[PDB]
Amino acid sequence: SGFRKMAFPSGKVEGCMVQVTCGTTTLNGLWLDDVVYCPRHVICTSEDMLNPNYEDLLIRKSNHNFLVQAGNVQLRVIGHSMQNCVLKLKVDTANPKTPKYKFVRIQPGQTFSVLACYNGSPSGVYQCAMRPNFTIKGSFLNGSCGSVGFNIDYDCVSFCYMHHMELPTGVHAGTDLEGNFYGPFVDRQTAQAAGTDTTITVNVLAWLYAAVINGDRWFLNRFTTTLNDFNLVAMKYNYEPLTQDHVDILGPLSAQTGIAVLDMCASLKELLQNGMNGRTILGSALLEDEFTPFDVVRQCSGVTFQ
Amino acid sequence: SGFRKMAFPSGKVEGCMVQVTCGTTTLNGLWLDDVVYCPRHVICTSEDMLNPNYEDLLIRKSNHNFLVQAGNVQLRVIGHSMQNCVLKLKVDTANPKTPKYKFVRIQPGQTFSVLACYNGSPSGVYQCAMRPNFTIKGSFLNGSCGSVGFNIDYDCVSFCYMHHMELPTGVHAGTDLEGNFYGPFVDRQTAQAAGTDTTITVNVLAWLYAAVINGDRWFLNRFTTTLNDFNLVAMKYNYEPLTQDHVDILGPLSAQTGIAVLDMCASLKELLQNGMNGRTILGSALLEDEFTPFDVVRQCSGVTFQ
Ligand SMILES: CCN(CC)c1cccc(NC(C)=O)c1
Ligand SMILES: CCN(CC)c1cccc(NC(C)=O)c1
Ligand SMILES: CCN(CC)c1cccc(NC(C)=O)c1
Ligand SMILES: CCN(CC)c1cccc(NC(C)=O)c1
């Protein structure tokens, strides 16, 4: 027992990180098969970032201008192309440590692990969620662009995120591995504001189920509610509206705890209205929203879902 | 910027995890060079765990009774010995993925990463601290015994923890890799109670420095204090006493923030006396104590310490 924010083991992704240098800009790439993926802003000088025209900047770049280093080995670049906001560098050597993998574009509320990297070298791993405003709240310093986010199912790495930049408010924006930004952001050094960071209700519910399973039960109340009554409350507190799709994926936790989803919603409603009164749940004094229902069911062995 | 609870990349340790079966008990081992390390309770039946005599139980075990599996490959056991509460199984094959490594026994307050594993297969990674009562607050389900905790310095893995059991209160106990328990615990299925779980003051201070660096400054107050005045307050709130050794390792953060260590102590004292008044620090509504000063300096690039 116990319940922790837990990342995926990172070794499968570690073996894919490389350093990419163009001119005087160095960042991280992702080497899969014979392609290296990286943010296209590798081609920009810091001054170019103010108002880049990427197509124009790319005219002055050849294969031999992209330096790709995998530990000590230099990789030979034999082609390059731009796909949305990523560059794809064709190299002459397939990565021997390529894992089984897919590229997936996740929805807001979904969680994933980030392998923060500098100069192609992995430094740390942590779990993130895609916020409803399409930012993530990461930890990223100079040189971490091109660090990736992923999920693992058995032996298959699903890559869902590549880090591109930090907003003025200190939250993070990036792309899928086809180079499409999450949210409205662009790869330009011009101030860009995030929308409302609402709480991922379905995740808070999952985590409340996790707390019950671990014996944190003080917050369980005597009430139930309806989806509409609950949503009236959610909206007030900047919680995402709960739908029947959300209710459906909470089914295994309801069954384990014997606590009906709507009963748990009524407990959550009272927490929102009364606060926690200085108490904790799973060692937190706030309601945690970066565990999905699927995440919980992975750390609560006695939840039946498969 | 941003600040996250971040584990070490786990790939170096992933390549060392094996499954160890003895009779009908299966758990995890750590394969380094030609030795596999695992909890000695692998030899016990569930009934044996009530009151095991390990020396006596071991008389009835031979090399061929320990099944060691590395993925599909079965490893041949050519010797075994008990060292404190661990078994060392000599195998005929050195692990080809052995990293540079050391065994270290950590102090209370030190942090490390756990690679939670089942059947020799890594499932998740998270950061832990050794609590002042010599427990950890982990996430461990059936079959996770022999999962390890570690730190990485550049290319060298320092192993500091091996998981052995869960106390009745749902917290975790284990050994160093020489098989000595942290704290007073024993590998027997008899109820064992933990002492006071005090807060690691020096870590809370480090994390307050991390918050300042990231622009969370609301809690900075107008006061300073002394080590004795502060410690009078610490004791009341079940905080570890702060020493000049602690003050010394906070030196780089004081220098960066220009906030004297004692000034930060005075801010902490006011948080203890007044609470957080519904505010957050680094997205927490409580004072976080599982980041060391060394941990902070790794995610706050503009802290000068080397
Ligand atoms: C838009 C400008 N760019 C891209 C070069 C930018 C802005 C802020 C921060 C970072 N770097 C990280 C690691 O987020 C990168
Ligand atoms: C029904 C089983 N569970 C959670 C218990 C499940 C199954 C499919 C998808 C998701 N989705 C998320 C976001 O967790 C969750
Ligand atoms: C003392 C009995 N043992 C050892 C077999 C024990 C007790 C509780 C839990 C676990 N297992 C884990 C993963 O902690 C193991
Ligand atoms: C002085 C540099 N730092 C932290 C900034 C440092 C150096 C050596 C040891 C520890 N120790 C811990 C527990 O963090 C910390």
XYZ file of C-alpha atoms and ligand atoms in Angstrom, chain B residues 109-110 203 248-253 292-295 297 305, ligand 4:
30
model
C 16.617 13.254 5.839
C 18.453 12.050 2.730
C 14.818 20.167 3.728
C 26.442 25.245 6.339
C 24.834 23.228 3.534
C 22.203 25.940 2.985
C 25.045 28.440 2.235
C 24.620 28.496 -1.617
C 20.893 29.189 -1.376
C 17.535 18.131 0.225
C 19.638 21.297 -0.282
C 21.566 19.268 -2.919
C 18.309 18.338 -4.669
C 20.605 23.183 -6.288
C 27.760 25.884 -5.368
C 26.555 23.005 -0.320
C 25.943 22.339 -1.548
N 24.943 21.390 -1.078
C 23.583 21.844 -1.128
C 23.563 23.164 -1.838
C 25.282 20.145 -0.543
C 26.605 19.700 -0.549
C 26.955 18.539 0.125
C 26.008 17.803 0.812
C 24.687 18.229 0.825
N 23.738 17.499 1.558
C 22.394 17.457 1.422
C 21.695 16.586 2.426
O 21.784 18.094 0.563
C 24.340 19.390 0.150
